[PDB]
UniProtKB/TrEMBL annotation:
GO molecular function ontology, one term from the record: oligopeptidase activity
Catalytic reactions on record: Hydrolysis of Pro-|-Xaa >> Ala-|-Xaa in oligopeptides
Keywords: Hydrolase, Protease, Serine protease
Record domain Peptidase S9 prolyl oligopeptidase catalytic: where: 453-659
Annotated Gene Ontology cellular component terms: cytosol
Family to which this protein belongs: Belongs to the peptidase S9A family.
Gene Ontology process terms (BP): proteolysis
Lineage top rank: taxon: Bacteria
Name of the protein described by the UniProt record: prolyl oligopeptidase
EC numbers: 3.4.21.26
Location of the Peptidase S9A N-terminal domain: 4-395
Top class in the EC scheme: hydrolase
Length: 668
């Protein structure tokens, strides 16, 4: 094959007296007719190359037929009915269903119909204590503004005219009298808490907080505890920290007491028991902790740990009279159950290694529900018995994939400097460690972003083709604490790549795959990961799949959106030492002729603001104008799920084809 007309400019740039040429500068713009014409030319070559693959269509068909499936949420009692969300798979918004014990279920609220075009979406949902009245917020178009509608649950008709000009608001009831919500005006950027009493006009809502100078804040929220005894008000000016106040509603005109009076830390209410407040906070605990303090004197100096901080970030849930501490260990879920007195009842016996959701309920819920999934198990709902700790299946996934046919196993491998690193490997059950399995190695590594297991239809399809999917939890991510993040940043970015390299090596040595049966993939920070790893070890793998990646390090910051990845990448505009470090790995700057690179397909949109196409365009030109091997270097430029399906189909087809497959490793 022959690549398009990629002429070489001369735009040389100097950094610390050092001279580095940039033959492909023009491409840095995605409007210039010489560039936009380039795209058209490049896509013609890619599509032309892909039209060559025999089984691409078959792959697309399977992806398309399994891409969408029905879903159901956990049931929850409100008044005399059990409510639950469902989605037939093609509905844009989830539909809320209802069922009275002894009768068939019925649609209760379908948000899709509110808008003849579906632009009116359901936001917050909140029932009165007796479950007879429903308050819910709707967002129109795509506005931050909201309206709170009130509905009589039985008649399913408007109870009062909707509350207007509501924003960044929760909806919290005080018994069956009314509820607290937040707004910016008179139901300035001074957010205020109001109380709307049922049977009254919005204009008469009582201003609860935010009016006097001392209470001015950009964001305020209000929550009434489940027993209706305490009102908690949070106030903040940014995503960093918040003030918190409490008011004992069991007393007449009780004043507000300060739980936390500064913005030096996040603190939020979990629940109360009697006069004891249970709070989650990161004050003096980066990984957070759950503390208690009496409402009558709630200041920080009086908080006492109930669940002390740990090495893993804490998240707390409450239901059925218990507290559930959820953590991420080696990127997978762990849940421990505690009573309200601090006693550790047990560790919840989760279905396996993966991701969970749930464990949220009322004080008197007889049982709790939680969700579980991983690379080999689609989202499943389970019933958890608080006392016995017994778990039972509530609703299996409707996804067209039999869980029993797939396996996911965790492995740990040592990198260059000896650092231990997690790695989850998934494949159809029955695989042989003969080193012949076609494999895709995925990684990210960076921005404290950790890769937790999640079910992907695309991935499941890959497994059905007989492929192996491997995800590595590289440094730079947030799987092992703050230290794990920096261990792969600045002039330590190379550590991330070494972790990736050892991952590949490990997969072979263990008999999973082998060099010719291995491909690596990643997007953005991940797109860089594949870019580098491929330039430093273009022998380690057979196929490279860099998507929406940042490939020009020596000057990425010179791009609008690219001016937010400072803390991690650093720039060639800090020191010649940093500059040197960047050049040393910068994918774009590490591609040289005479070198045989693995088959490569770079993917990007025609125009994108988050990660500019230049990184992919220029990088493409380079590889084409450098590779001295028989493997093609291509670029696919995007111009709905249909597009995601087509994209996944092109990637799997290209991969298998480049591994020398005439037919699919396994007929799905």
């Amino acid at each position: 094959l022959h690549y398009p007309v990629t002429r070489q400019g001369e735009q040389v740039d100097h950094y610390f007296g050092q001279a580095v040429a940039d033959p492909y500068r023009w491409l840095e713009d995605d409007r210039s007719p010489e560039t936009e014409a380039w795209v058209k030319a490049q896509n013609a070559v890619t599509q032309d190359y892909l039209a060559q693959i025999p089984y691409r269509a078959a792959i697309k068909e399977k992806l398309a037929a399994s891409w969408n499936y029905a879903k159901e949420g956990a049931p929850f009692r409100e008044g005399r009915y059990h409510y639950f969300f469902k989605n037939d798979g093609l509905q844009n918004q989830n539909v809320l269903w209802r069922q009275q014990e002894g009768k068939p279920a019925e649609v209760f609220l379908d948000p899709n119909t509110l808008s003849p075009d579906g632009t009116t979406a359901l936001d917050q949902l909140s029932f009165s204590r007796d479950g007879r009245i429903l308050a819910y917020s709707l967002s129109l178009a795509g506005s931050d503004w909201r309206e709170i509608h009130l509905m009589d649950v039985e008649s399913k008709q408007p109870l009062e005219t909707p509350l207007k000009d509501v924003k960044f608001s929760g909806i919290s009831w005080l018994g069956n009298e009314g509820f607290f919500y937040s707004s910016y005006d008179k139901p300035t950027d001074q957010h205020k808490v109001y109380f709307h009493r049922l049977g009254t006009a919005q204009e008469d809502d009582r201003l609860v907080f935010g009016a006097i100078p001392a209470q001015h804040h950009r964001y305020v929220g209000a929550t009434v505890t489940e027993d209706d005894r305490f009102l908690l008000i949070s106030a903040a000016n940014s995503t960093s920290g918040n003030r918190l106040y409490v008011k004992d509603l069991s007393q007449e005109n009780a004043p507000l007491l300060t739980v936390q009076g500064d913005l030096d830390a996040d603190v939020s209410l979990v629940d109360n028991k009697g006069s004891t407040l249970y709070l989650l906070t990161n004050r003096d605990a980066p990984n957070r902790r759950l503390v208690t303090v009496d409402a009558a004197n709630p200041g920080p100096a009086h908080w006492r740990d109930l669940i002390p901080e740990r090495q893993q970030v804490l998240t707390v849930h409450s239901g059925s009279g218990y507290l559930f501490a959820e953590y991420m260990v080696d990127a997978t879920a762990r849940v421990e159950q505690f009573d309200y007195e601090g006693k550790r009842v047990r560790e919840v016996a989760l279905p396996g290694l993966g991701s969970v959701s749930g464990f949220n309920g009322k004080h008197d819920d007889p049982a709790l529900y939680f969700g579980f999934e991983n690379y080999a198990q689609p989202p499943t709902l389970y019933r958890f018995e608080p006392k016995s700790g017994a778990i039972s299946l509530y609703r299996a996934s409707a996804a067209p994939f039999k869980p029993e046919d797939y396996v996911s196993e965790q492995r740990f491998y040592q990198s260059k400097d000896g650092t231990r690193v997690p790695l989850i490997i998934s494949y159809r059950k029955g695989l042989k460690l003969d080193g012949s399995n076609p494999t895709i190695l995925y990684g990210y590594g960076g921005f404290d972003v950790s890769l937790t297991p999640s079910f992907s239809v695309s991935v499941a399809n890959w497994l059905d083709l007989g492929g192996v999917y491997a995800v590595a939890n590289l440094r730079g991510g947030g799987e092992y604490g703050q230290a794990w993040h920096l261990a792969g940043t600045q002039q330590n970015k190379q550590n991330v790549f070494d972790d990736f390299i050892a991952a590949a090596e490990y997969l072979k040595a263990e008999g999973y795959t082998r060099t010719d049966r291995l491909a690596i993939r990643g997007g953005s920070n991940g797109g860089l990961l594949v870019g580098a790893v491929m330039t430093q070890r273009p022998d380690l793998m057979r196929v490279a799949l860099p998507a929406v990646g940042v490939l020009d390090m020596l000057r990425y910051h010179t791009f609008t959106a690219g001016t937010g990845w400072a803390y991690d990448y650093g720039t060639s505009a800090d020191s010649e030492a940093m500059f040197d470090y960047l050049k040393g790995y910068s994918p774009l700057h590490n591609v040289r002729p005479g070198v045989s690179y693995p088959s490569t397909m770079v993917t990007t949109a025609d125009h994108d603001d988050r990660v500019v196409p230049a990184h992919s365009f220029k990088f493409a030109a380079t590889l084409q104008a450098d590779n001295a091997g028989p493997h093609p270097q291509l670029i696919r430029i995007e111009t709905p799920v249909a597009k995601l399906i087509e994209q996944s189909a092109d990637i799997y087809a290209f991969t298998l084809y480049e591994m020398g497959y005439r037919e699919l490793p396994r007929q799905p």
